[PDB]
Design a protein around this ligand. Structure first.
Ligand code: ZN
Ligand code: ZN
Lengths: 767, 716
């Protein structure tokens, strides 16, 4: 009998929900992601920005090697700070630039000790003494509080931004503002399903909403347009034309951009032109009988254009089918049965060609970020198509078997949402640490060419990066462990800025303290990514083995070291890790580490990619889906129906449920469902009547439906990806797929089969 | 008179021979020194002849295939004729049945030696006018050129096809008639294409398109397009030449027509406003620090881009010629554009070449306008895809031709082993023809002899026509009739016929071994045909049938054609291009300028090109074919400097001041490449243009001295 995930979620919800958590204490253990509390800074960066797998590190390499807890930090730097919480301050140290430790080069933060009357300070990270520069000098007070320590946000806060001076800029000239390039696949596929005109029509609408800082009057971001079908059509949209000009480039193989000026333009100046263009593109290609297309030469071009304007930018590519047309970048239609113990299964998660990896390199090199809206209808080799956006720090939206009368809304939101996203460009992040350890590994929508500087062509409030630490030397139980996460980037107003997150953690030589300070959600997040990146180098049986052997080894160490003497028939878990065997099982149960029958490679590669980026908020939900009961729903006044475990063993034939994992949202109806509900909710009298196929939100009724809609609304609200709704008839219908999201069930092995499997290897090791 | 003979057989048959009586034996032909050769015009203006709308008759022998001519013997009874050339007996066609010694067909009439026929080929093709426009120039020049094109567009036949490729850093193939959105296919200005590739890429089929569309359909759109043409966008850093891809642009032009309308009348009209600066066909670098190829540069082996880039245009030309298309070049800039390297294209196809200071000048606007001169019937004086076939009596074989043409390498019994010029063939293709287009053909001996000139072409009306000329000249026993042979000598025609021989040699590998070659023959020619006593130079005399020929050689050897040091390699190429094209009259004027004198004392007169004719009480009008120069003698100058002409007393000094300028005007209208004009006087900084037009055999010298060294060399 184990503490269920939901018991644990709700417990901590009770204990800490709707209470202010203020980060003023080193090594504090923030609430779980599944708790909506209020956060106040006061010292250590908000857990909305950063969470760790332990908030108390081990102090010796051996001790860590003993417990086999991974030390790691999930970082989501540009996370959306909620309305009722404090915004980041923008600190500005003048011409000199932000103050820094001379040796580690750490930025002025609260972990900087002032000594000798305020003349000098000693870095917390490296224990080196720096001279306080004249302009920045101030008087220590009673204890060196350095009067002003509550006034200046670089001295008292965990998170703030620095204003970046010119030596932080490419070529030491102030960076230009970015630009969005909009790129449409106008082949036959996409003229038929009605997609192209959707994209052109809505956009007319959308462009308006491009973001602009509050200090400026119009967005400084320029906009350009290209449409391709195995040949690339560029459009001129300069301010002075009543008609837009088209210039086709047919020499793919050595692509180039046919113009300078007229390609990227202020939307407002060139408004009328652009509408006239966007009016015409759909018609323009109406009798296109073309079938094959080209992909890489499109990114290639977009990148070359942002190179030529000398600015960072974001590519908005809308594409349909496997690019088969002969150009560099061709992808053959090959999928193979090399995937159980093959040891070559890794070839399936890699791109086909060596051009995608380099191209990704070219983009990051020039601050170009590509985003891909993909509308498959057959194998598309997402392993290759989605490689560039992932390394380039963009997104992959994939809409299988898209149909205009269903997923039109899914698509339109994601485009709306991706445009208006707060964004940063041409960023490089690096995570500094106190004496005694260093970041040795990274996992994200990222690209690294040395071992220190995480390069991210673009970054949004949604993308997160997990950072794995190992041990250099030794950590003191006096100092604790420090992290300073610092991100160089370029704003949409063309300013170089420096976001800085500082965290302070405790350290300890007592193995007890290690396990007391763990976070499951974060540990899962590290494991997941660590595993998923391994997919590209090792066999999936070797991967899973490493995962189980390190799960047991964790509990086995806590058994034989901090476990009060209890019988050998028991499995003793600490409190931070009640639910870790459960979650760990679900990770291994997920198709990315599992087998072919009934899943495409595409669905596997898509999943493999999405996760890497994920925050801790998102990686929680994706592996342990939310299952809401709706038949028992209260009529009014309550935020949501409490959650229920993810097993078929909580389903009622008289019932109506809602399951979401962050990408799919299922609405499920028992054969015996109460037709009263079936009429308010769907407006049809009989379970018999309703159609799985007509998955379009339902218009009418006010008693329920509305209650249902809102909660689904409550459900969507913080997720980046609007979720495809999938109605499910209870028996003898598709539910076969829905079943797969019932994660505590068997389907590999169930929760009570892995909890059994780990206790075998736990006892394999004894004493 | 022999003169009346020559003038008659030229106007009738387009022919001018070096000899009009031929040595019947190969050897005494070899020691005639000047070869048996003809200046031939295939489309010589012939308003008197009436076209015959019926197929010609070709001798039934395969190797021969000659056309029925007056020289043939006919037996009207029995309906039979025999080829004069091969002696084969041939029947007549059905429709000919009523053939009557009185009622005999046109072409058997001695009046009809030269005659034209109207084929019924079948396909009636439109005309094709591909404009290839450079955009690297000032808005001054590009606007002016734009205007020059808009009118050219108005003059075209309604059925005509037009297209517009523009270029600069990159090459644009515009899609025309594509209304409401203008689309154009863009190519790197640095990568050469094959037509096949261009056909695939422009999304074309094999063998109206979206690129070439009928003028009556696309007039509003194109003209509008042209009006909206602006100069190459990409800016030009300080101390730099633009990136101009002359080379690739043309290659794309030639391609676009090679693969849509192969083998039919078309004219690629390329307007450039600078040198090519980004190869292939590159002519110079893109930094102004390095001046362009200079003859001295090119001679000292310090012109890197001449061999490479020439072999490029040389390939295009033959690619253009293979498909029956013309390449005009229209070059206007304050410095060179690489006419030297691109010369083959105008030269091998029937192309025009025009050279000017800028497009915004009368000189150009007028030159360009003429090119669309219409005849009485309202059709262009143009011809396309001509195919020239020359047949000769057995005794005679062909060495080859020199002029605007390309060999089809047709072997035949009429083909001599020792070839000259474009040789080893009895068929040339002349891609573009004009009533002026003139070829030098070079014959070779091995009762009369005959040569038949058959020219099929595409008349501007799109009517496919054939023109046939048959000429005969008498055979002579050179051991007996030497005088009868020396009597027939065309000093005028032989002179030109040599000039081209000499000039065509100065394109091939030979160095200054030409002033040498050209004098050795001139001395030989004296020896064979001069009256003298050995070693009595004073003794030398020349027949009136020869007396002018050494004065021609004197002028030819000192001309811009051979002394190319004082000219821009582009100039020299442009002079030579017009000379090899021209009939005898013009050809003659180029080599020896006509000078006229205007004085109070009598009407205007042809005077010698000597200093002696420059007088201070005389106005001169020099008329080199290329330039028109008016010279005021020192006294008439001051009279003009004092304003006398305006006063009503001096009506007569007003009129002497006007009469040359009147004639200057006439010449500035009938001549196709409008001639530069010069108004100068004694001491004028531009007087030099006059004073300059007025072992080796000799160092450059006076005419009389020239004759002296010659005489004393002849008689030894
Ligand atoms: Zn430091
Ligand atoms: Zn015959």
């Amino acid at each position: 009998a184990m503490g269920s995930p939901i018991q644990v979620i709700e417990n901590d919800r009770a204990s800490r929900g709707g209470q202010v958590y203020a980060t003023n204490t080193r090594g504090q253990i923030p609430p779980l992601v599944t708790t909506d509390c209020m956060i106040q800074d006061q010292g250590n960066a908000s857990p909305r920005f950063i969470r760790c797998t332990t908030y108390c590190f081990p102090c010796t390499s051996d001790m860590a090697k003993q417990a086999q807890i991974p030390l790691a930090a999930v970082i989501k730097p540009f996370a959306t700070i909620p309305s009722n919480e404090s915004p980041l301050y923008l600190v500005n140290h003048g011409e000199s630039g932000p103050v820094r430790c001379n040796r580690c080069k750490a930025y002025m933060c609260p972990f900087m000790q002032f000594i000798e009357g305020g003349r000098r300070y000693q870095c917390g990270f490296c224990n080196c003494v720096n001279d306080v520069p004249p302009f920045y000098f101030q008087h220590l007070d009673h204890i060196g509080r350095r009067l002003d320590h509550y006034e200046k946000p670089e001295l008292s806060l965990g998170s703030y931004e620095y204003v970046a001076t010119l030596d932080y800029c490419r070529k030491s000239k102030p960076p230009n503002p970015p630009a969005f390039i909009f790129m449409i696949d106008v082949s036959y596929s996409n003229i038929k399903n009605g997609l192209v005109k959707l994209i052109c029509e809505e956009l007319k609408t959308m462009l308006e909403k491009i973001p602009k800082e509050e200090q400026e009057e119009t967005s400084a971001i320029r906009v350009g347009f290209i449409t391709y079908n195995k040949v690339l059509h560029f459009f001129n949209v300069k301010s002075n034309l009543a008609q837009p000009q088209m210039m086709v480039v047919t020499d793919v193989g050595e692509v180039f951009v046919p113009l300078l000026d007229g390609f990227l333009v202020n939307y407002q100046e060139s408004q009328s032109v652009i509408h006239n263009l966007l009016d015409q593109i759909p018609d323009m290609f109406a009798d296109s009988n073309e079938n094959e297309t080209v992909f890489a030469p499109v990114i290639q071009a977009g990148m070359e254009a942002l190179k030529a304007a000398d600015c960072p930018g974001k590519l908005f590519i809308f594409h349909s089918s496997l690019p088969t047309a002969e150009a560099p970048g061709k992808l053959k239609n090959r999928d193979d049965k090399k995937l159980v113990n093959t040891d070559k299964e890794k070839i399936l998660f890699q791109p086909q060609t060596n051009v995608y990896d380099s191209l990704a390199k070219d983009c990051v090199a020039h601050g170009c970020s590509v985003t891909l809206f993909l509308f498959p209808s057959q194998y598309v080799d997402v392993a290759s198509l989605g490689l560039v956006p992932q390394l380039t720090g963009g997104t992959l939206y994939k809409y299988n078997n898209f149909q205009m009368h269903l997923d039109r809304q899914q698509f339109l939101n994601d485009l709306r949402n991706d445009i208006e996203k707060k964004i940063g460009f041409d960023a490089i992040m690096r995570v500094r640490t106190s004496t005694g350890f260093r970041a040795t590994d990274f996992f994200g929508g990222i690209l690294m060419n040395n071992t220190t500087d995480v390069e991210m062509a673009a970054i949004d409030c949604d993308k997160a990066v997990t950072v794995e630490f190992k041990h250099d030397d030794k950590l003191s139980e006096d100092s604790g462990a420090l992290i300073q996460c610092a991100v160089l980037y370029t704003t949409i107003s063309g300013q170089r800025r420096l976001r800085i997150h500082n965290l302070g953690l405790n350290c300890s030589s007592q193995l007890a303290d290690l396990y007391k300070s763990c976070e499951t959600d974060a540990l899962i997040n590290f494991f997941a990514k660590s595993a998923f990146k391994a997919v590209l180098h090792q066999p999936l049986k070797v991967i899973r083995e490493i995962l189980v052997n390190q799960t047991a080894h964790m509990l086995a160490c806590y058994r034989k070291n901090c476990a009060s003497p209890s019988a050998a028939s028991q499995l003793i878990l600490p409190d931070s890790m009640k639910v870790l065997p459960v979650y760990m099982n679900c990770l291994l149960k997920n198709c990315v580490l599992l087998s072919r029958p009934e899943i495409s490679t595409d669905e596997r590669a898509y999943q493999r990619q999405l996760v890497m980026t994920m925050g801790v908020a998102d990686s929680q939900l994706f592996f342990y889906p939310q299952l809401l009961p709706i038949h028992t729903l209260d009529v009014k006044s309550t935020m949501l129906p409490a959650a229920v475990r993810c097993s078929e063993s909580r389903l009622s034939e008289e019932g109506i449920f809602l399951l979401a994992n962050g990408l799919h949202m299922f609405l499920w109806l028992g054969v015996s469902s109460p037709p009263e509900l079936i009429q308010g909710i769907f407006n049809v009298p009989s379970f018999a009547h309703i159609n799985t196929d007509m998955t379009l939100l339902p218009e009418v009724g006010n008693p329920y439906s509305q209650q249902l809609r809102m909660i689904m609304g409550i459900i969507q609200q913080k997720r980046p990806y609007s979720m495809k709704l999938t109605i499910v008839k209870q028996r003898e219908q598709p539910e076969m797929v829905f079943r797969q999201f019932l994660v505590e069930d068997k389907g590999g092995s169930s929760y009570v089969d892995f909890l059994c499997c780990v206790h075998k290897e736990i006892c394999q090791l004894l004493n | 008179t022999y003169l009346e003979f020559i003038q008659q057989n030229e106007e009738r048959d387009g022919v001018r021979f070096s000899w009009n009586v031929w040595p019947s034996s190969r050897l005494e032909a070899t020691r005639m020194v000047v070869p048996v050769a003809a200046l031939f015009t295939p489309l010589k203006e012939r308003p008197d002849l009436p076209p015959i709308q019926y197929e010609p008759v070709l001798c039934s022998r395969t190797t021969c295939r000659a056309v029925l001519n007056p020289l043939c013997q006919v037996d009207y009874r029995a309906k039979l004729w025999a080829c004069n050339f091969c002696y084969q007996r041939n029947q007549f066609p059905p429709s000919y049945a009523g053939i009557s010694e009185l009622n005999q067909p046109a072409e058997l009439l001695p009046q009809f030696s030269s005659i034209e026929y109207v084929v019924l080929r079948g396909p009636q093709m439109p005309l094709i006018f591909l404009y290839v426009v450079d955009t690297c120039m000032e808005d001054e020049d590009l606007q002016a050129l734009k205007e020059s094109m808009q009118m050219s567009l108005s003059l075209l036949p309604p059925t005509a096809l037009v297209g517009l490729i523009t270029f600069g850093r990159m090459v644009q193939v515009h899609e025309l008639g594509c209304e409401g959105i203008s689309k154009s296919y863009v190519f790197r200005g640095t990568k050469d294409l094959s037509a096949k590739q261009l056909q695939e890429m422009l999304g074309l089929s094999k063998v109206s398109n979206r690129f070439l569309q009928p003028v009556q359909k696309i007039d509003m759109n194109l003209t509008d397009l042209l009006g909206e043409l602006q100069r190459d966008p990409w800016p030009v850093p300080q101390g730099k030449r633009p990136l101009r891809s002359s080379g690739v642009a043309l290659s794309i032009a030639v391609g676009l027509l090679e693969c849509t309308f192969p083998n039919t009348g078309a004219r690629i009209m390329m307007f450039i406003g600078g040198p090519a600066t980004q190869g292939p066909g590159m002519v110079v670098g893109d930094e102004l620090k390095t001046p362009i190829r200079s003859w001295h540069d090119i001679d000292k082996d310090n012109a890197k881009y001449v061999k490479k880039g020439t072999k490029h245009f040389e390939a295009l030309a033959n690619r253009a010629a293979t498909t029956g298309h013309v390449i005009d070049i229209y070059a206007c800039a304050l410095d060179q554009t690489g006419l030297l390297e691109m010369k083959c294209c105008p030269n091998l196809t029937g192309g025009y070449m025009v050279m000017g200071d800028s497009f915004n000048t009368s000189l150009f606007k007028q030159t360009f306008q003429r090119v669309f001169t219409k005849d009485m019937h309202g059709q262009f004086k143009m011809g396309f895809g001509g195919t020239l076939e020359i047949k000769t009596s057995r005794e005679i074989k062909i060495s080859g031709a020199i002029g605007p043409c390309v060999s089809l390498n047709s072997k035949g019994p009429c083909v001599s082993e020792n070839e000259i010029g474009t040789g080893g063939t009895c068929q040339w293709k002349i891609c573009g023809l004009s009533p002026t287009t003139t070829l030098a053909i070079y014959f070779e001996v091995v009762g009369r002899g005959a040569i038949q000139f058959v020219t099929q072409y595409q008349h501007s009306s799109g009517q496919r026509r054939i023109r046939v000329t048959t000429i005969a000249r008498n055979w002579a026993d050179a051991q007996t009739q030497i005088q009868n042979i020396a009597a027939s000598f065309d000093q005028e025609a032989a002179a030109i016929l040599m000039a081209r021989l000499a000039i065509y040699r100065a394109e091939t590998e030979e160095g200054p071994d030409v002033l040498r070659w050209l004098d050795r023959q001139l001395i030989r020619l004296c020896q064979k045909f001069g009256e003298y006593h050995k070693d009595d130079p004073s003794s030398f005399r020349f027949s009136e049938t020869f007396s002018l020929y050494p004065q021609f050689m004197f002028h030819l050897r000192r001309s811009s054609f051979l002394q190319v040091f004082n000219n821009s390699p582009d100039e020299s190429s442009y002079y030579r291009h017009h000379f090899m094209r021209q009939d005898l009259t013009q050809s003659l004027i180029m080599i020896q300028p006509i000078l006229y004198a205007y004085s109070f004392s009598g009407p205007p007169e042809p005077v010698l090109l000597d200093s002696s004719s420059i007088l201070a009480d005389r106005i001169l009008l020099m008329d080199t074919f290329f330039q028109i120069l008016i010279y005021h003698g020192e006294t008439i100058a001051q009279w003009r400097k004092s304003g006398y002409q305006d006063m009503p007393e001096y009506e007569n000094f007003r009129h002497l001041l006007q009469a040359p300028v009147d004639d200057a005007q006439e010449i500035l209208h009938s001549r196709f490449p409008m001639p530069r004009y010069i108004d100068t006087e004694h001491g004028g900084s531009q007087a030099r243009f006059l004073l300059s037009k007025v072992p080796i055999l000799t160092d450059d010298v006076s005419l009389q001295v020239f004759m002296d060294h010659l005489k004393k060399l002849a008689v030894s």
